Amino acid sequence: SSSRNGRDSAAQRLGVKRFGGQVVKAGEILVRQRGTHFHPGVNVGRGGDDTLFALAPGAVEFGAKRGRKTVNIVPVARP
Amino acid sequence: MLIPRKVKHRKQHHPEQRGIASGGTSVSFGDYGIQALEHAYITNRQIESARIAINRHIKRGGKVWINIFPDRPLTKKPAETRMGSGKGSPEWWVANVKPGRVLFELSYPDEKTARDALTRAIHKLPIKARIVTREE
Amino acid sequence: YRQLRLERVVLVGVWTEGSAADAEASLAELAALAETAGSEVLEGLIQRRDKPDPSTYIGSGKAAELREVVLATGADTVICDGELSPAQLNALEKAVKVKVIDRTALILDIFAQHATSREGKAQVSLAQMEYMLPRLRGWGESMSRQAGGRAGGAGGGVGTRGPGETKIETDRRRIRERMAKLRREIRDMKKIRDTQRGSRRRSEIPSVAIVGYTNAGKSSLLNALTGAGVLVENALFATLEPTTRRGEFEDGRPFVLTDTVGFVRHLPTQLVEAFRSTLEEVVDADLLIHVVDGSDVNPLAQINAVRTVINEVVAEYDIAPPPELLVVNKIDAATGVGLAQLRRALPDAVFVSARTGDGLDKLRSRMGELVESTDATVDVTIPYDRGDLVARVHTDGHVDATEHTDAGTRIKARVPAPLAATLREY
Amino acid sequence: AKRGRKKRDRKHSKANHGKRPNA
RNA sequence: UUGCCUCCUAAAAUGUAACGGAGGCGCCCAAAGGUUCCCUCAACCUGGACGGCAAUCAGGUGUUGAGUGUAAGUGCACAAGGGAGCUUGACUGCGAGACGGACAUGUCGAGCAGGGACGAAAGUCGGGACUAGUGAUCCGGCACCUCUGAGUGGAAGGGGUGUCGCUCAACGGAUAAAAGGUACCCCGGGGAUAACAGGCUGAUCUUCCCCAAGAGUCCAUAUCGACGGGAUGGUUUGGCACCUCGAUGUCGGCUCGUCGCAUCCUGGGGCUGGAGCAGGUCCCAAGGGUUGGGCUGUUCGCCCAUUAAAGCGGCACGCGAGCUGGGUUUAGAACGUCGUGAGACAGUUCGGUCUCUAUCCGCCGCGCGCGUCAGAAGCUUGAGGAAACCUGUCCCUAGU
RNA sequence: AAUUCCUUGUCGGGUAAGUUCCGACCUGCACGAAUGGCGUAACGACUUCUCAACUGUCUCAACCAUAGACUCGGCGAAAU
RNA sequence: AAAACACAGGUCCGUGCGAAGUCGCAAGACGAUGUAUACGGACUGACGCCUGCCCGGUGCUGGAAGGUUAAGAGGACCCG
RNA sequence: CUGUGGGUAGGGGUGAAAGGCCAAUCAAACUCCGUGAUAGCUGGUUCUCCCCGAAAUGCAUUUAGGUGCAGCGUCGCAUGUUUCUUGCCGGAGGUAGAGCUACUGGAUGGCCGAUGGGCCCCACAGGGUUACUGACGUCAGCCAAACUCCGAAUGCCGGUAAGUCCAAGAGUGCGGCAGUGAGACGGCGGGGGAUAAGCUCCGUGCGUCGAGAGGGAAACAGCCCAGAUCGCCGGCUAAGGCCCCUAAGCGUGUGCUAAGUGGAAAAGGAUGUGCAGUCGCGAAGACAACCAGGAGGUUGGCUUAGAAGCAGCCACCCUUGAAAGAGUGCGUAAUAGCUCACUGGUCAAGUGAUUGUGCGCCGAUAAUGUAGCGGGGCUCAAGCACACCGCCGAAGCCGC
RNA sequence: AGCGAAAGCGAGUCUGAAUAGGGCGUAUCCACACAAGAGUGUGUGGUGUAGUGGUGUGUUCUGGACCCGAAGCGGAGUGA
RNA sequence: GUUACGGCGGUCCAUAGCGGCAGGGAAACGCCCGGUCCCAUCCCGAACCCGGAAGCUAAGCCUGCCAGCGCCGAUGAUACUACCCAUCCGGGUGGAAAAGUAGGACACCGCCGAACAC
Numbered sequence A: 001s002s003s004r005n006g007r008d009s010a011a012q013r014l015g016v017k018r019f020g021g022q023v024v025k026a027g028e029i030l031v032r033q034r035g036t037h038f039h040p041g042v043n044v045g046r047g048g049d050d051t052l053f054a055l056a057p058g059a060v061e062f063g064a065k066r067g068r069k070t071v072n073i074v075p076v077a078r079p
Numbered sequence B: 001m002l003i004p005r006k007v008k009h010r011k012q013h014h015p016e017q018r019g020i021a022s023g024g025t026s027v028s029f030g031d032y033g034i035q036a037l038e039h040a041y042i043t044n045r046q047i048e049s050a051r052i053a054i055n056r057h058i059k060r061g062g063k064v065w066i067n068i069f070p071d072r073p074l075t076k077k078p079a080e081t082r083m084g085s086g087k088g089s090p091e092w093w094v095a096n097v098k099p100g101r102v103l104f105e106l107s108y109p110d111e112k113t114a115r116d117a118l119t120r121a122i123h124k125l126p127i128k129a130r131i132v133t134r135e136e
Numbered sequence C: 001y002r003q004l005r006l007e008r009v010v011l012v013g014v015w016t017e018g019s020a021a022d023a024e025a026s027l028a029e030l031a032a033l034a035e036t037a038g039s040e041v042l043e044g045l046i047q048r049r050d051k052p053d054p055s056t057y058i059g060s061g062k063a064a065e066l067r068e069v070v071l072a073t074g075a076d077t078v079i080c081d082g083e084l085s086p087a088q089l090n091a092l093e094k095a096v097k098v099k100v101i102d103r104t105a106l107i108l109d110i111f112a113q114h115a116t117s118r119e120g121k122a123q124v125s126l127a128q129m130e131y132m133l134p135r136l137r138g139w140g141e142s143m144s145r146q147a148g149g150r151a152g153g154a155g156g157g158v159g160t161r162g163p164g165e166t167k168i169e170t171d172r173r174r175i176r177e178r179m180a181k182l183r184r185e186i187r188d189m190k191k192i193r194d195t196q197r198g199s200r201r202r203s204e205i206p207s208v209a210i211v212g213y214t215n216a217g218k219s220s221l222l223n224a225l226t227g228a229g230v231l232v233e234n235a236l237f238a239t240l241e242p243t244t245r246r247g248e249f250e251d252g253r254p255f256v257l258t259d260t261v262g263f264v265r266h267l268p269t270q271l272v273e274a275f276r277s278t279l280e281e282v283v284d285a286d287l288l289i290h291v292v293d294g295s296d297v298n299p300l301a302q303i304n305a306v307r308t309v310i311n312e313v314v315a316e317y318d319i320a321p322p323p324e325l326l327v328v329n330k331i332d333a334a335t336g337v338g339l340a341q342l343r344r345a346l347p348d349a350v351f352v353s354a355r356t357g358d359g360l361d362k363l364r365s366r367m368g369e370l371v372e373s374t375d376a377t378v379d380v381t382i383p384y385d386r387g388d389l390v391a392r393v394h395t396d397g398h399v400d401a402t403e404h405t406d407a408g409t410r411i412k413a414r415v416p417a418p419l420a421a422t423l424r425e426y
Numbered sequence D: 001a002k003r004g005r006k007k008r009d010r011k012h013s014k015a016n017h018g019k020r021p022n023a
Numbered sequence E: 001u002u003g004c005c006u007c008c009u010a011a012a013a014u015g016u017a018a019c020g021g022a023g024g025c026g027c028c029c030a031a032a033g034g035u036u037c038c039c040u041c042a043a044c045c046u047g048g049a050c051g052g053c054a055a056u057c058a059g060g061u062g063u064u065g066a067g068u069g070u071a072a073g074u075g076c077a078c079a080a081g082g083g084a085g086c087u088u089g090a091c092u093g094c095g096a097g098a099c100g101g102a103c104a105u106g107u108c109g110a111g112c113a114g115g116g117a118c119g120a121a122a123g124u125c126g127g128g129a130c131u132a133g134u135g136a137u138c139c140g141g142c143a144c145c146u147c148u149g150a151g152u153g154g155a156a157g158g159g160g161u162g163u164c165g166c167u168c169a170a171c172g173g174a175u176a177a178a179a180g181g182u183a184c185c186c187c188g189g190g191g192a193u194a195a196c197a198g199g200c201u202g203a204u205c206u207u208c209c210c211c212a213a214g215a216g217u218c219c220a221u222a223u224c225g226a227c228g229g230g231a232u233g234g235u236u237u238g239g240c241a242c243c244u245c246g247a248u249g250u251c252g253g254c255u256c257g258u259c260g261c262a263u264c265c266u267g268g269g270g271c272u273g274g275a276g277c278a279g280g281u282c283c284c285a286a287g288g289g290u291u292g293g294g295c296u297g298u299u300c301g302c303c304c305a306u307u308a309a310a311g312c313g314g315c316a317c318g319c320g321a322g323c324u325g326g327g328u329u330u331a332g333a334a335c336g337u338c339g340u341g342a343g344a345c346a347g348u349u350c351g352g353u354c355u356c357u358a359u360c361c362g363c364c365g366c367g368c369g370c371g372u373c374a375g376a377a378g379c380u381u382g383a384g385g386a387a388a389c390c391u392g393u394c395c396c397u398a399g400u
Numbered sequence F: 001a002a003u004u005c006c007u008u009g010u011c012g013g014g015u016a017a018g019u020u021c022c023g024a025c026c027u028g029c030a031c032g033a034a035u036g037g038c039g040u041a042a043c044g045a046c047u048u049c050u051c052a053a054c055u056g057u058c059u060c061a062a063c064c065a066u067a068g069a070c071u072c073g074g075c076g077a078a079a080u
Numbered sequence G: 001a002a003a004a005c006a007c008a009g010g011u012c013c014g015u016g017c018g019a020a021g022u023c024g025c026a027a028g029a030c031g032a033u034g035u036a037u038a039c040g041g042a043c044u045g046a047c048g049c050c051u052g053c054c055c056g057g058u059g060c061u062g063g064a065a066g067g068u069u070a071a072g073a074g075g076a077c078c079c080g
Numbered sequence H: 001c002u003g004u005g006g007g008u009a010g011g012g013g014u015g016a017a018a019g020g021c022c023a024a025u026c027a028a029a030c031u032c033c034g035u036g037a038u039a040g041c042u043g044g045u046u047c048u049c050c051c052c053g054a055a056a057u058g059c060a061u062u063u064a065g066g067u068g069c070a071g072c073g074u075c076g077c078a079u080g081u082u083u084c085u086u087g088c089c090g091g092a093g094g095u096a097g098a099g100c101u102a103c104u105g106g107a108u109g110g111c112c113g114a115u116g117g118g119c120c121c122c123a124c125a126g127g128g129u130u131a132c133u134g135a136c137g138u139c140a141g142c143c144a145a146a147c148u149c150c151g152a153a154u155g156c157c158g159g160u161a162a163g164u165c166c167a168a169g170a171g172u173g174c175g176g177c178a179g180u181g182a183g184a185c186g187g188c189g190g191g192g193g194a195u196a197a198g199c200u201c202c203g204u205g206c207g208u209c210g211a212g213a214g215g216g217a218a219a220c221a222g223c224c225c226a227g228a229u230c231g232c233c234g235g236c237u238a239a240g241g242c243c244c245c246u247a248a249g250c251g252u253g254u255g256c257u258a259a260g261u262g263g264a265a266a267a268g269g270a271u272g273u274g275c276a277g278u279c280g281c282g283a284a285g286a287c288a289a290c291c292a293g294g295a296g297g298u299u300g301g302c303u304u305a306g307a308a309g310c311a312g313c314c315a316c317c318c319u320u321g322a323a324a325g326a327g328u329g330c331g332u333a334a335u336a337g338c339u340c341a342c343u344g345g346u347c348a349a350g351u352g353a354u355u356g357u358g359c360g361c362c363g364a365u366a367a368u369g370u371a372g373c374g375g376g377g378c379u380c381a382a383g384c385a386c387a388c389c390g391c392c393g394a395a396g397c398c399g400c
Numbered sequence I: 001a002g003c004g005a006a007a008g009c010g011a012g013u014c015u016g017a018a019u020a021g022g023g024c025g026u027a028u029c030c031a032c033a034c035a036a037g038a039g040u041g042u043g044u045g046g047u048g049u050a051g052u053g054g055u056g057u058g059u060u061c062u063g064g065a066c067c068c069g070a071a072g073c074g075g076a077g078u079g080a
Numbered sequence J: 001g002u003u004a005c006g007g008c009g010g011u012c013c014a015u016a017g018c019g020g021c022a023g024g025g026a027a028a029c030g031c032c033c034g035g036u037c038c039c040a041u042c043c044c045g046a047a048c049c050c051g052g053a054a055g056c057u058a059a060g061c062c063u064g065c066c067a068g069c070g071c072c073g074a075u076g077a078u079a080c081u082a083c084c085c086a087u088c089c090g091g092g093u094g095g096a097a098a099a100g101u102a103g104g105a106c107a108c109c110g111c112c113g114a115a116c117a118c
């Protein structure tokens, strides 16, 4: 016989790249996703391909605003 | 006989034969029931055989419920073939039975005849099963 | 069990010998076999050719003509009678690219569908082997479909290996030994019969066997006569094993009645092993009964069809024209009037009509008075004071009242041979 | 199948603890 | 089948194979992009004209159930879905800090001149809801450039910037340019990889069983037993590819065997649907026996004439350093078929080298040596083995 | 059929018993007219069947002699 | 060792004669000291009855008017 | 046919064509040279010891038994704890599980039974017995890798505190040199297969072998214990053992086991344990013996070959409760013969059925030879549980 | 002495109309300030940057390239 | 500082929602009367936008009470599971659901500005 299957795209290596509590520079990619599983939060921007990145530096913080998981950057005061 | 009118996926992984049944583990329709005690793929062939056994024993009268439904397809690659060249096409339909699942149920006046019919079904079945009752 | 998908269908009459009417009969017969396999007839065409085409069977032009209606119908059931050689099946499959039916495989797989007993299905599997072994290495879905019979030059020069025998001969030896074992497997039902073979037969239980064309009503007659519950359905081959039951007469001697598997015409001849169950019943029977339904197809062609095989088997077997009784029963509610011509062609009309009419007294007579016989006309005169002298006569044999108006008179009864030979003892 | 059956079942021993190479 | 995208496999990060289960893609966009501002979709009536299941715009009702340009998902009702106004953010030119990242491809673009509107102020945009819709380098095209210009002036040519040309789709792309046969074959390798045999599995096969609906004349279990279920054996076809390709000779017959019992002839049993004579069936039993021919190489199988019967299997489908070569499987040739041919056939046919002085074990016989507590000799017991074991007709008993 | 898978095609001959052989039918998977079609006397270490005779081919093997084998003396290898 | 090759016989094709064909770069040679009733090539294969249809594909043999069609001194124009 | 002398020579000769012959070689002779051809292939590669020590994976590949780079080794430098373990804390997830009336898909019954078919009044007016499809669905209880209202455990990312820290001989970076890129089995999670394979393909800060000796599994790379620096004729132990082979223990206590179970399996049956219930039993006589009981309309009708108690056919629902059922069992033409139940006394302790509750049982099966404890042997356990004591046991640990 | 593709400029240079930022360079390190906490920069001041020839060793390049081994290919000759 | 106040916001955005029973407009919020004007309908002054307070708390909004639908939801137990013991069976330690049950809940908090008070 012959199977009509056998194909698959290259895994795109999505998911969270910085988890809550990780301190990030201004511009780091916090999440990679195809929709908005996470929505951009404070000082977090959403890119063309729905990549969540840090608009400002500081620690990643996962929260929820109006029933939508959100990625926030909380500033880290310099000690 | 018992065949799904349509399955979303014709070729499925073998249902996992692990754990005790979480649902359908008690008589809920009839007076008596056949409870499984071992894991098995109860094929529709076996279900038909057991159901006919019960109905013919209990003769005229009584009611028989078949709780399980053989909705899981199991494939069989064509005879005398080498490993590979894709998955075989569905060949037989089974119901993933796990221990403690009540496969059949019976409501019949005579307890003697009911137990005999259920025992005959258990004989047609491919695993250990016991005649459980509703009365706990 | 080697089934096939039919649902919709269109028929064609090959008609390579005989009359258009006979070709239509054969077409409708195979369409009924198709229904038995499960289908729904739509319409049937006819053609008129000489010896089948050695390669295409139906020819290139008719193959394309039928491919046209095939592609119009969009199903795979187009029916055409006949026995197709492996080459003919190859050519037809290449032409049509779909599944066309042949009489032999249709009969064989309907036997598979209807089989319920171990012996029956073993016989049908033997027929499968007989039919398929020729369809090996050559036919459509063959073993050597450019994929089989690979093991060729395994010995260029020589070395440390080699299977030996010819590949095709070994591959055939597989099925040859399979069917050799299956033919060895032949079970003697004579051991089941012996309860009445030597005993009874000789002990007077005569043997009436109902044989006839399929759908005719053989099992229905068995049930009506013997109060049985035998399977009754319009489908072809409703009866699989030749069952039997009891049925008595005014002259007692329970006539062990036996039904059979019906005939149609030009049977495959490979499932003669399957039919041995009924062939043996005919050969060992002392009264054959043909059953003909009231409004049955054709005036008389099914009778010739059955009688062909009857004559062949019985003449090969023994010196016998076993009593045949072509009774015309089950005629009420036949919903037809053109039956006087058949009645004059053969005088009989004894309606049981699936018990609706129940006028089988004439039958119950014929069955019986044809070939019934014992040591009738024995005058067992006895004082009637001993009690022993009346023993066993009214129990084993069967009295007929006769002069026995009282006990002190001439007492006679039709008794078995063993019971009384000189036991009158005046 | 006696040979394989024995070779396999001799893993059920106190020393092997129910496991052997090649079953 | 080969590249790309989506899903599940994938074992809740990422990733993860199979000739695993499913599909899509080699596009569409001048609006389906940008931006401003508005709107929500399905499903039923109080009810409707031709009007129906479905049109209407019937909102009259009804809570985010449809729709996303397109596969799949992740998303989107806050809208990313539906409408309009303007417009061309593919900021094109320059580019943040950052990040996704075997080596060869992606996300924000915060800032800059110059824009787009809507507007009104604030405001947002580097084609698209997002991930596919593509092809390195080399070679050359074509435009522009304040670059070089083989003595100088230009020029040719080159360079830069921007772009273009590959179903290079075998999609990391041997060449710009390429199909077959080999049985006439050859060499380098491989038990990394098939054919025989061994091994594992036991689907298939083979022997049985388990319940007993039925068949057996009334009478599941005399004989059988479907629908289903459970295993044995490892003699079939297979699956795997584990030793062997610095060679394990391959069928059939012959010779010689040896073993198992799943017994083709003794024992009783029962049951017998055993009256008798004969049968069937299982139980026990492997002592011995179990053929001669015709057809075919033939294993088998059919047949012939017999017999108590002409048993089934294992032993490398036992046995070619024991034999034969009938077929199979080199080279010659012909036929049929396929091939525009060399050739091929999983078809037919005729013809076609069967090597080896036995070292070791093994086995059949035979010696020599030494033992058996002095050296000899006759006769010996028998631990232990080896051999053999077959059975048929006719008479009476009794025509009981 | 040196050609036919179905195929041991069907029928008749020949045998006691004929997957072989001969003659026909021929529904030629897949004969065919100068890679010639069909016949053909003669010819053939060709292939294939039949019969007579003949016989150790065989039933079923026995015996005899030579050459080895075996023993003795001399010379004296080999593959592995 | 044959059923294969050859064979005598056939048919087709080529060849006007230091022929065609072949060996040679060439000269030359063979063909042949021959002459189309001869040579070479192809196929078939005594002999007998015959070799039926087809020139569509591909070769070969002729050429029907066109169109396509390199190599040149046809050299406008254009460019340094 | 043959002698002698000649001619034709290698991509060539010769060939009544076999790819034949051309100096024992011919599908392109031979010799020399190019030349030490080239071979991703096979083989071989020679002294020692000290330290460390892999890989059999990813990607790509005219690639798949090769190679590049990465991964992993080593040696130098540089950083120095950044590594790793454990606790805590911040995280995202959609697996196991579960649920599905939370979606997308497969299922018991009443409800409307709406859209409908016959009956329907036969009218198309109008309405119901409406066993019928009985829908969307209403309401009651069940499955999915490509279902999710949910949802762990681990794992992973990050932070923090410690631990390890005369070391893991850690992590990272850059260099010199690599080898590896054929993996195997075992446990767990999975795909393909028949949820076979000692099968195949994956995952696994999983292990071991590979590359690992030593002890135990009998023998036995991958299983268990345990990682060999050397020497001891010392000791304690691990796994495993402890009757003799073979070193303690034919250990102690309480039980079970009757088959050699132990020392192979899917099973029908209960007669071994203990259970725990349960009718009647009490020595207010229970299961039992001896135990008069044998024609009530008793051939009861059914019906008739008799249908006698009795082929059969549902019945006989009754009493001085005497102990007898219009009588189920063997019969038997049919009666008859002789009894099942219960009884009437002696009745001289228990008597049956039950989930078998759970232990431990018994029914089973290849071919050289016991043969499925390693052997002898073991049930007077040397078998099996539960306890409890010792030791024997390695290259382990300790001692020197 | 680098940057760039050069007119080239030069501790700068290339890109860019755009002193807009980046690329690559200015050994390295230390102090001072100015700044910004976007991951540190800017200048200023200090010490002054280290190659290159032999040669050992390990890899490597071109050669036979650690050694052995084809079938075969070519040139020229030898053989009827 | 008090309100059956209006807005702007927060909640790991329903414990908040939906539905029901009753209540008020003081300033406000609204409905509401018109389209002359800015502005607007792919038609409509319905909406948007513009002027007024004629009328009304009937609606919207808000207050209290209903646990009816939805929402949350334990604790136990179980499933599952990391590691470990275990010769197939299982078990231990640590974590621990989903469902269901008890129940909770008819929201809570911050800022302004309103009317009155001060």
Ligand SMILES: CC[C@H]1OC(=O)[C@H](C)[C@@H](O[C@H]2C[C@@](C)(OC)[C@@H](O)[C@H](C)O2)[C@H](C)[C@@H](O[C@@H]2O[C@H](C)C[C@H](N(C)C)[C@H]2O)[C@](C)(O)C[C@@H](C)C(=O)[C@H](C)[C@@H](O)[C@]1(C)O
Binding pocket: C157, C158, C159, C160, E247, E249, E353, E354, E355
């Ligand atoms: C007389 C003298 C020759 O004898 C034979 O001809 C026998 C009769 C051959 O067998 C015959 C065998 C035969 C006849 O059988 C089919 C056929 O194969 C050919 C013709 O040779 C031999 C032994 C062949 O071997 C066999 O080779 C086979 C390929 C496989 C087999 N084994 C490895 C599996 C192996 O032994 C083989 C290769 O010639 C052996 C090689 C060493 C030789 O060439 C040697 C020199 C032989 O010529 C010889 C022994 O001297």
Ligand SMILES: Nc1nc2c(ncn2[C@@H]2O[C@H](COP(=O)(O)OP(=O)(O)CP(=O)(O)O)[C@@H](O)[C@H]2O)c(=O)[nH]1
Binding pocket: C212, C213, C214, C215, C216, C217, C218, C219, C220, C221, C231, C232, C233, C234, C235, C236, C237, C238, C239, C240, C259, C260, C261, C262, C293, C294, C329, C330, C331, C353, C354
């Ligand atoms: N109307 C009618 N139908 C009849 C009559 N006889 C037979 N049939 C039909 O035949 C069917 C039964 O066939 P059957 O009696 O088995 O015939 P059969 O001879 O046994 C053929 P088979 O052996 O293959 O079953 C019934 O369905 C019945 O309708 C008749 O007299 N009248």
